[PDB]
Symmetry: C4
Subunit: 31 residues, 4 copies
Amino acid sequence: GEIKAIAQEIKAIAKEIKAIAWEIKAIAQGY
Amino acid sequence: GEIKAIAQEIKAIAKEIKAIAWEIKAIAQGY
Amino acid sequence: GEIKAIAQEIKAIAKEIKAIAWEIKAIAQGY
Amino acid sequence: GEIKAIAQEIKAIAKEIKAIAWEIKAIAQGY
């Protein structure tokens, strides 16, 4: 139900945040 | 309903973190 | 029980991530 | 069930994002 829907949405946002964090790490280390 | 409320809190803080990550990704390319 | 605890644990880690993201943002801004 | 499994997935991605955020702060601080 609703709690499963909300948990799938949080997992999608968490995977988006992790992809942006790896992009930021690339810029911080310059490669 | 108590677990759904904590999941909605988590989704809000995840959207806040994604917003800040986008602000960093912009700034860190000189945008 | 356990599902409420896992949700509380996620919320605490998300708050920690948000605090680190603000610190990273300040450096990215030049401060 | 599925809610517990997605919650444990979220908590593992959150801990990966916290680790990358601390790696980015280390690199930006020259630690």
